[PDB]
Design a protein around this ligand. Structure first.
Ligand SMILES: CC(=O)SCCNC(=O)CCNC(=O)[C@H](O)C(C)(C)COP(=O)(O)OP(=O)(O)OC[C@H]1O[C@@H](n2cnc3c(N)ncnc32)[C@H](O)[C@@H]1OP(=O)(O)O
Ligand SMILES: CC(=O)SCCNC(=O)CCNC(=O)[C@H](O)C(C)(C)COP(=O)(O)OP(=O)(O)OC[C@H]1O[C@@H](n2cnc3c(N)ncnc32)[C@H](O)[C@@H]1OP(=O)(O)O
Lengths: 449, 450
């Protein structure tokens, strides 16, 4: 029951994508408004053949296959998502047909839901299960699957789609520092899906950031106060090697980390260099006014950029090339950190921030240990093969991407149809699950390969 | 963290209800088809003023006040439900407005969802938190809230509504027998909500039985197989004092337990006398697929289980027979009925619990009851819950006002920008209850209190 945490990961995202310069040109945006403004390069999206069930299958099987895992030492399977296929029958039950011919039905877990936080909540539920009296020696399995889609408004470029599987068990290369974490949650209306027919949420763009910031502050503060009662020291951005955040878009991750450096100034931490009086015009602000001062954002970005290149920039590859993955975004960003720093990460500490509108948030700490294959940081980066998957995409022209998104609107919550395999089944990878049909009774049937 | 389990409970259901006798006559049903056929006596339902948020508020507040517990000793809050108000913003966040006047925002937990099982999943998640390295000494709090509503068909009589709150912490009167449990989960289309506009579920004939049986079988089997590796002996009907079931309607609880006695016959348990081994054996030539469909083996099973049923489950039936189907809260209103009817008894006993959600998800787990010190004692819980006084405080609807309300709820489901009609209905609410005032142009919801 020791040092339980992530033993394995694998990632799946649709190979169908659009590129953002191409989408700046298509819509009416100044050049750089997506590439530099939002910090995004490529937008992955589900075609009519893929969904959160489909992507879940690809991520689950590929973790069990490549890590050579017996489906029968899965004691708990939990799914984090915000895409509603059915309002009563969970994604977890759909996933159970991977374990049907395996005889394994004594598995715990269901869906956890609140915006982009359910995946993290499931991960936390799962670790606490392994350290539970109810444990049975078997592996936990966590799924993060989402398709981020918006109306043709200014939020459509911030879309995405992906699925991530994580095997939870003891003596992990990725251990949880169980007590070093902090949560913040309130009742706020910054982003939510109240229109049950529509796959599109109402977004209160202003307040999305404002709420995200208040939570990131309170989470950091609570975390620092638990570091203080455990190891006697104050916590600072220099007491961690890498910071990885929920990544709805890149410019929000920039500001979020720069905001962590601002929080160090109001407590005068060892992380604030003396050349870094550049802040001091803003110490007359209350914390309510701090959130809205567009220069304090703009100032914090200036001295944190060198820190950002060292402690955040490796966490950016897949979010910058897939888009917003909701519950899975934070863990694709961590997957980017594994792929580009697997050879170094032994012994390091990585702090993780998860956010979901509503709102729910938690900042928690991982310390990485070197371990032994197949559950080793070096083998995870190999199995994820992030480089080859990014290398295996197909871009849509910006006008056919818009045509796909209008087909998805009519297929959402839709009855009685067969999916159109014309030409598209060709571009997904050999072995992937995909949606074949949904019958007159909304039942869904999937194929493979 | 030690002897962790349920420390406190409180239950809320709407005071507006229908009696099923009155509704047999109204719906044009055979006499007895609801009271005896389904075993139900009274059906509670939400008016335009109440919903799962409202009911959650009532259950949470009433638990913290009546047990005098500080909101800043809540470390984790989880909600189990299947009523979708919003597809992204959880019920859990709505509950956080009870904690803002406290500054306590360092609470873990979100919504857990799968049919009538999400509440059990939350309870289990919460138990595993107190025993986790991540624990912080504070109480866990679990909510089960649902409004069970159907279109006007043969399932409308099986409606219900309630919310239940449970305080999780160590050294409890209701301890969890952590390793004595069994789960079963599969991909079935027996009951599900695929039409996102309607709050009504699709049901595929009697597939729940076929599924409910396979799950109740597999779960009981797995639990028995863990009893032998724990305590050497086989498990039987007699190695527990009370059996509590997911209670969508009463007649399913009868068969569910009667079906457990059949599973004891097929395992030669110490609970099967020769009068029962006789009556069962004409039926052991059946495959387990055919057993599911034998309308004769059922009724034989209910006959040989009647005295066991009268002793080990009938007290677990009070609230469900007088409220209706409460989905995620169904199992725990039944357990609340057991505490209310035998708090003077429940010290030392073993109580086995069965939970099901279509989809499907299932777990049978065991609780041992300890007499402990007030306020966290079985006798004070039954006092605080006061289910008897809550039931005496109902207001009965005539069967056509219940039907008029239920098509009004269809007009408010997923609807925006309206104000609710409090006149005459708010009269019926107890002093203290939360209620919905309006939903504005942005679907935002606003609640009031008496
Ligand atoms: C849990 C979560 O938080 S994820 C789910 C909630 N969040 C979401 O869904 C994303 C919401 N969708 C959105 O589109 C975002 O709200 C927004 C902010 C991009 C709204 O879209 P816009 O109308 O374009 O907003 P805005 O005008 O502020 O543009 C954003 C950025 O691009 C910059 N920008 C604008 N045009 C350009 C340009 N040609 N070149 C470079 N940068 C530009 C702006 O300076 C701004 O950056 P800044 O904050 O550093 O000043
Ligand atoms: C959803 C879950 O998680 S678990 C499954 C629970 N299902 C639900 O919640 C949704 C389904 N809702 C329903 O109401 C179900 O469809 C039903 C079966 C209860 C109702 O459909 P009906 O056609 O009215 O049921 P049916 O005709 O089989 O009669 C029900 C019982 O009452 C008996 N009955 C019929 N008429 C009478 C009468 N006058 N007097 C006494 N008993 C009668 C029947 O013999 C039968 O008893 P039995 O099951 O012991 O053999």
């Amino acid at each position: 029951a020791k040092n339980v945490g992530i033993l394995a990961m694998d990632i799946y995202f649709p190979p169908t994508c659009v590129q953002q310069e191409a989408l700046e040109a298509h819509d009416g945006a100044s050049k750089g408004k997506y590439t530099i403004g939002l910090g995004q390069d490529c937008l992955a999206f589900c075609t009519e053949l893929e969904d959160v069930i489909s992507m879940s299958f690809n991520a689950v099987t590929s973790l069990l296959e490549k890590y050579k895992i017996d489906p029968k030492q899965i004691g708990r399977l939990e799914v984090g998502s915000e895409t509603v296929i059915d309002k009563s029958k969970s994604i977890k039950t759909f996933l159970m047909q991977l374990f049907e011919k395996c005889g394994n039905t004594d598995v715990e877990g269901v869906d956890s839901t609140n915006a982009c936080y359910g995946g993290t909540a499931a991960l936390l539920n799962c670790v606490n299960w392994v350290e539970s009296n109810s444990w049975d020696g078997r592996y936990g399995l966590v799924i993060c699957t989402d398709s981020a889609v918006y109306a043709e408004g200014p939020a459509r470029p911030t879309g995405g789609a992906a699925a991530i599987a994580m095997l939870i068990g003891p003596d992990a290369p990725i251990v949880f520092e169980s007590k070093l974490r902090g949560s913040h949650m309130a009742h706020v209306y910054d982003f939510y899906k109240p229109n049950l027919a529509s796959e599109y949420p109402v977004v209160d763009g202003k307040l999305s950031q404002t709420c995200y910031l208040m939570a990131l502050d309170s989470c950091y503060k609570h975390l620092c106060n638990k570091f203080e009662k455990l190891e006697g020291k104050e916590f600072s951005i220099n007491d961690a090697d890498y910071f990885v955040f929920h990544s709805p878009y890149n410019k929000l991750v920039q500001k979020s980390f720069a905001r962590l450096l601002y929080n160090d100034f109001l407590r005068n931490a060892s992380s604030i260099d003396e050349a870094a009086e550049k802040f001091t015009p803003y110490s007359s602000l209350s914390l309510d006014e701090s959130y809205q001062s567009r220069d304090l954002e703009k100032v914090s970005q200036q001295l944190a950029k060198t820190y950002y290149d060292a402690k955040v920039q490796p966490t950016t590859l897949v979010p910058k090339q897939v888009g917003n993955m909701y519950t899975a975004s934070l863990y694709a960003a961590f997957a980017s950190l594994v792929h580009n720093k697997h050879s170094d990460l032994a012994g390091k500490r990585v702090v993780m921030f998860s956010y979901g509108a509503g709102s729910t948030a938690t900042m928690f700490s991982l310390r990485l240990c070197e371990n032994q294959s197949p559950f080793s940081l070096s083998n995870i980066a190999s199995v994820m093969d992030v480089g080859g998957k990014l290398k295996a995409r197909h871009e849509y022209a910006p006008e056919k991407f818009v045509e796909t998104m209008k087909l998805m609107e009519h297929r959402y919550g839709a009855k009685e149809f067969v999916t159109s395999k014309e030409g598209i089944l060709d571009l997904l990878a050999p072995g992937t699950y995909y949606l074949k049909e949904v019958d007159s009774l909304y039942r869904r049937f999937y194929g493979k390969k």
